[PDB]
From Swiss-Prot:
Gene name of the record: mauC
Positions bound to Cu cation: H53, C92, H95, M98
Span within the parent record: 27 to 131 of 131
GO (cellular component) term, any one: periplasmic space
Protein name in the entry: Amicyanin
Source organism, top-level taxon: Bacteria
Organismal lineage: Bacteria, Pseudomonadati, Pseudomonadota, Alphaproteobacteria, Rhodobacterales
Role according to the record: Primary acceptor of electrons from methylamine dehydrogenase. Passes those electrons on either a soluble cytochrome c or to pseudoazurin.
Amino acid sequence: DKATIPSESPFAAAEVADGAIVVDIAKMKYETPELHVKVGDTVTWINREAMPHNVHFVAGVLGEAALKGPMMKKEQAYSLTFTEAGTYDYHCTFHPFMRGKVVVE
Ligand SMILES: [Cu+]
Ligand code: NA
């Protein structure tokens, strides 16, 4: 697969790492919908609002099957570590019109 998962479950936003690369979720949008990172970087999404959200990569994008992230409540976080260059689109399972991408250089 093209990413690894440091926290299977959502975790508290207060425990986001050291200078972490963060994508905030608010107002039904990923706030940084075109994020550029490098191979080896970890991206952390943080839901800033009451409406639950997740991140969802369709089958084939990060592995043979879809990567459906866990439901994230307000001030919950979820991370993925990208190990291969490429562009990886995602959406919110609950709200598929909400889209973003990670561009890994
Ligand atoms: Cu959503
Ligand atoms: Na912002």
